[PDB]
Amino acid sequence: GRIQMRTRRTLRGHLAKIYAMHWGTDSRLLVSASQDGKLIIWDSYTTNKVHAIPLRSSWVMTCAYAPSGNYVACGGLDNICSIYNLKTREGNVRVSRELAGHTGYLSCCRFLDDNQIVTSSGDTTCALWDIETGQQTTTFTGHTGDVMSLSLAPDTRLFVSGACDASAKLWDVREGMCRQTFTGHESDINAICFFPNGNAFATGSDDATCRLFDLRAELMTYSHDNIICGITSVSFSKSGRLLLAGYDDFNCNVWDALKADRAGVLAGHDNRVSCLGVTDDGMAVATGSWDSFLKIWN
Amino acid sequence: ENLLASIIQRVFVWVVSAVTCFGNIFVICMRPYIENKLYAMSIISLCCADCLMGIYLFVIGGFDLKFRGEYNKHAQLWMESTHCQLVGSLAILSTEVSVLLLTFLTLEKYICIVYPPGKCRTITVLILIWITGFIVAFIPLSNKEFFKNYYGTNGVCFPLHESIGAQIYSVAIFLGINLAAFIIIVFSYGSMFYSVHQEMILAKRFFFIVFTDALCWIPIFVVKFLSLLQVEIPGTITSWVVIFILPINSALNPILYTLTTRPFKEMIHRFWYNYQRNEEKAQREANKKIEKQLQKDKQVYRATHRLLLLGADNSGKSTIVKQMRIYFETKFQVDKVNFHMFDVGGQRDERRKWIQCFNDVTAIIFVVDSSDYNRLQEALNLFKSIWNNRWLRTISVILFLNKQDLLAEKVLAGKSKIEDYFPEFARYTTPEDATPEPGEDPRVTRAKYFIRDEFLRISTAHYCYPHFTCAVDTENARRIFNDCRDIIQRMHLRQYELL
Amino acid sequence: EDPLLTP
Amino acid sequence: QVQLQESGGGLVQPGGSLRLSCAASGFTFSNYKMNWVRQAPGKGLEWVSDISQSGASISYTGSVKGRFTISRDNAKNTLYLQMNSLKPEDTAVYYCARCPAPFTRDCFDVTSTTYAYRGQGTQVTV
């Protein structure tokens, strides 16, 4: 019926426009990147900072937390998904490696393991790197539009990518070809996220409409006449029955993945909801907008 | 026979008490829904002082209605009772605290506007102001024997109008520190207005604030001046003074700083749209170190100013960065102000979705050629897209018409027809406000202000700052710095509920 | 297994 | 699948007339401001006409203002360019452009390539 969850914690540490966040595997230790070139690790429960990495680029576009929790990825227009190691024998966090092999902005780069990471770049491509060698292990081309987002399957055998081509395509991690082509959107795609089952993926475009695609193929749509504003970040719950889209109405809109109705509205933010995240266990929702706040919702 | 004998007195006491209470309740209910946290909490404190004054008005009304027609017998009892000097202390506390908070807020606005302080400092100064109000309102009350019931001089119990031990305090609080507070407020808003102009709604708003302050407190100064000048004024006149004109702030500050401002309307529209222990102590120490690190980082990050650079491929986009490298990224210093000019152009020409990540940037510098007329139309298209973009609708655009020399010799040569690419030039006359530039033909001025004209007509159909530049002049950094100072002014006024 | 949907 | 189809063409003597029909398939034609673009041999892309969502605001490039005009047949969800007395120098392929975002006026339709919202186009030889 209704989902009325409020700002259970407020994280006021950030001092610039928050651009991207990512939950850890243990449902804690948020990674959050802001416009001050700062990449801050939070403990969600106690609301305390443990690491504050100074990024090279103030206007960072994406940040990522490794599944092992020892590495953190930073990416933007500088064509680099820098990997930083947290567990240092010297006791001080320092940069570890840099991956520079693209001519377009890495809008999102997320890990698979401690060694290999997939990146979605602004020059109409994706790339699986191995950070042990530094060479771009696999390249992914076939999008005729600026790639804006990608999502990683739970088994990490497929990763889906959405571009400004108004189409979202899968890519195999190893072989590197797109099996299924989905073109049912209407404007530029700004976010995408795998369904928890891994057999489907939701995609939020700038046409003020979200579309959930299933690989058995437009499969489902989420839109209304009142909303005339786009979607920035899309996230799924643990069970997948609930979806959250960061509309630019200065507040999140919570939809139902199966009913396509108005499940709720998460108001409380002053600007564009830059990024959304849901825990592995479905406990908390972390929302990062340009008001420099990580709003936690439970 | 009555504390407020005139019926006008009673009816307006009740009316103004209700108005004050309702306005401050609305301010309390609506302020957390709307930029700057310190300003918001200072507004909350001012609202608390105003509603304390409203409570004082309510309790005076209640005491007046307690003895209606029998006030003569109970007159000396209230003269000596602790209630009278208690409510006098409460009223004086409300007035003094509200005045001090207003001065603090206006001085903060002045120091943020004319010359472009942390949560801890805000709490410290706010609590110090409240404690100063308590001390000022209670020093007569503490030394009861010496102050001969200072508060209970008049029947209203607010001692505006007795011997030397009372008049010295009265002129020390009202003629002493309230007049200086008036001087601070009026000088601060005069300086803000002078700095802003050297648009029209700002002057009107400042006039309203200073007019409210004047209408409330310059009659208090006048009556204290006559009282100190041995001019006879009976206590009923200061009774009207306390009843009518003193609570003006308590009625108008809730509606002025909160109800008549633009973010209030924004919030209204938003509502309409909606409708083991060692580990803990180590973590605490790490949090303290990280918090001071983020303090230094916040000072650094607000010290610098982002400056996006945009234009055409043939335009002089890269030569601007190359010019101030002599003076992607490039950091420079102008008048001890750090600027961060970057020209991201190594990527693809598509720019609709990576331009959304430059919205906190102070200014987008749209530098484009003035000679290539196809590129001029492309510049018109790009400037239209920038101006009409949702996220660039709040970002000032510094328009630069680079290669003015190229346009000058291109129209002197007359090789290419401007009308073929833009027929309107056949029916255009030079603006009256054209800058006097001797030694150049009127054709150059006509064409150059003509391209300014389609740029500005699209802009008027954030603010646009059009300029002419070439690759020779090195002064463009100073002009960009002045424009950045102006943008600082407008958005600082935006943060303080003014613009 | 859905703390968001139900407490 | 956003589809833009250009219909109408053929070689035309200088000073002649023709019709260009931009048919839009897969999306609503009304919400988007529309543009006519043309690529000449040896030249880059340049959108020549723009029309707003309701047709209230119409703007033309200088080579188009005095010669020929644009219109929206929103009921037929299509764009008419009424070619009338075109200069012989403007032999070009006529592309149709839909602006990227709905309910807005910002448009970047002059991309060198990979702009998904332009049709194959037709070659007009005048």
Side-chain angles (χ1 to χ4, degrees), chain B residues 348-352 355 374-375 377-378 381-382 384-386 388-390 392 419-424, chain D residues 33 45-47 50 59 61-63 65 67 100 104 106-108 110 114-117:
Chain B
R348 294 165 60 243
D349 58 343
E350 177 180 356
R351 44 158 60 99
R352 34 188 195 268
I355 211 72
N374 298 271
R375 301 289 172 208
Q377 170 60 17
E378 190 70 281
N381 312 336
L382 206 54
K384 191 179 169 185
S385 313
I386 287 171
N388 305 340
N389 200 356
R390 179 166 168 176
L392 319 176
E419 293 83 3
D420 269 350
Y421 295 159
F422 277 125
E424 281 50 51
Chain D
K33 162 173 157 188
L45 277 296
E46 180 182 1
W47 75 257
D50 62 306
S59 301
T61 49
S63 60
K65 293 183 77 68
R67 283 85 168 265
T104 187
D106 47 299
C107 308
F108 316 87
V110 288
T114 72
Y115 190 87
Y117 299 98

Side-chain angles (χ1 to χ4, degrees), chain A residues 1-55 57-86 88-298:
Chain A
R2 56 99 177 173
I3 298 94
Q4 192 184 358
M5 65 182 179
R6 304 183 223 161
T7 302
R8 179 165 151 179
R9 273 144 200 92
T10 302
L11 283 71
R12 300 171 182 265
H14 265 302
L15 61 87
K17 300 193 154 184
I18 297 169
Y19 278 127
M21 49 72 61
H22 187 193
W23 277 89
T25 315
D26 51 355
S27 290
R28 69 205 57 209
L29 293 172
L30 278 299
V31 65
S32 65
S34 52
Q35 208 169 354
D36 49 350
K38 190 63 68 178
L39 187 59
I40 277 174
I41 301 299
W42 291 93
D43 198 7
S44 53
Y45 296 138
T46 181
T47 309
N48 296 115
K49 307 163 265 293
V50 298
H51 298 119
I53 297 89
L55 301 179
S57 47
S58 302
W59 45 263
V60 64
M61 221 175 298
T62 178
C63 81
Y65 211 79
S68 87
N70 283 307
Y71 302 96
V72 170
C74 170
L77 295 174
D78 290 331
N79 303 318
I80 303 161
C81 190
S82 296
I83 316 298
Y84 304 150
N85 45 356
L86 310 173
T88 301
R89 301 181 177 93
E90 310 286 330
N92 307 331
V93 60
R94 216 177 64 244
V95 305
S96 79
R97 276 285 273 273
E98 288 185 12
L99 319 172
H102 289 170
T103 58
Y105 61 98
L106 282 71
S107 60
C108 194
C109 51
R110 303 201 180 308
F111 282 81
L112 307 102
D113 63 18
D114 278 309
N115 290 318
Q116 47 178 0
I117 179 168
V118 299
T119 68
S120 66
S121 178
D123 50 0
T124 62
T125 195
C126 309
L128 162 72
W129 310 59
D130 190 9
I131 75 167
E132 284 188 350
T133 49
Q135 321 298 318
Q136 174 166 330
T137 300
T138 312
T139 184
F140 309 90
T141 47
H143 277 173
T144 62
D146 200 307
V147 181
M148 294 299 291
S149 59
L150 74 165
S151 188
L152 274 300
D155 58 357
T156 64
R157 302 170 191 176
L158 318 165
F159 68 99
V160 67
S161 188
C164 294
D165 201 19
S167 177
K169 296 184 191 185
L170 294 176
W171 314 86
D172 291 331
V173 172
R174 281 82 65 193
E175 290 178 352
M177 283 74 73
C178 53
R179 280 84 170 93
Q180 293 82 17
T181 310
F182 301 102
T183 179
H185 281 284
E186 181 165 337
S187 191
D188 301 332
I189 281 160
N190 314 87
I192 191 166
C193 182
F194 262 101
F195 190 79
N197 273 11
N199 210 8
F201 62 93
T203 308
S205 308
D206 193 75
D207 59 353
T209 296
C210 184
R211 214 161 300 261
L212 173 75
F213 303 104
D214 203 295
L215 277 297
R216 297 178 180 196
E218 72 264 15
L219 271 298
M220 185 64 72
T221 175
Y222 321 108
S223 52
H224 267 82
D225 277 17
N226 63 6
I227 62 170
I228 62 170
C229 302
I231 303 171
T232 302
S233 296
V234 191
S235 299
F236 264 116
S237 177
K238 174 173 183 57
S239 73
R241 211 62 76 94
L242 192 44
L243 181 140
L244 291 63
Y247 285 73
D248 46 352
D249 289 359
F250 292 171
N251 50 359
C252 298
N253 290 318
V254 177
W255 296 82
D256 186 74
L258 283 184
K259 292 178 188 178
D261 58 355
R262 290 322 305 272
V265 176
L266 300 177
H269 269 305
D270 194 41
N271 290 318
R272 170 180 205 59
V273 173
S274 76
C275 183
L276 292 173
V278 186
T279 66
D280 269 342
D281 63 358
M283 183 177 177
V285 170
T287 299
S289 179
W290 298 342
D291 49 354
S292 303
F293 285 10
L294 277 296
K295 290 218 163 298
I296 306 298
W297 317 75
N298 208 305

Side-chain angles (χ1 to χ4, degrees), chain C:
Chain C
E1 303 180 5
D2 53 356
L4 295 173
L5 188 59
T6 179

Side-chain angles (χ1 to χ4, degrees), chain B residues 24 34 38 155 172 199 202 304 313-314 338 430 465 493:
Chain B
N24 294 313
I34 76 175
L38 318 175
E199 193 269 329
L202 295 173
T304 78
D313 291 331
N314 299 349
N338 268 357
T430 176
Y465 309 90
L493 290 174

Side-chain angles (χ1 to χ4, degrees), chain B residues 99 102 106 160 174 178-179 181-187 189 205-224 241 244-250 252-253 256-257:
Chain B
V99 166
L102 266 181
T106 304
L160 188 61
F174 290 119
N178 264 337
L179 190 57
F182 203 68
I183 288 303
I184 299 299
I185 301 299
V186 65
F187 182 76
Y189 278 168
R205 191 151 191 109
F206 301 169
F207 166 69
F208 308 143
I209 302 141
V210 186
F211 194 43
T212 293
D213 208 324
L215 270 181
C216 184
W217 298 97
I218 210 68
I220 306 288
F221 151 76
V222 159
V223 67
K224 289 312 286 179
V241 160
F244 289 155
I245 62 171
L246 262 176
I248 281 177
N249 290 52
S250 304
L252 280 72
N253 290 139
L256 180 135
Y257 289 104

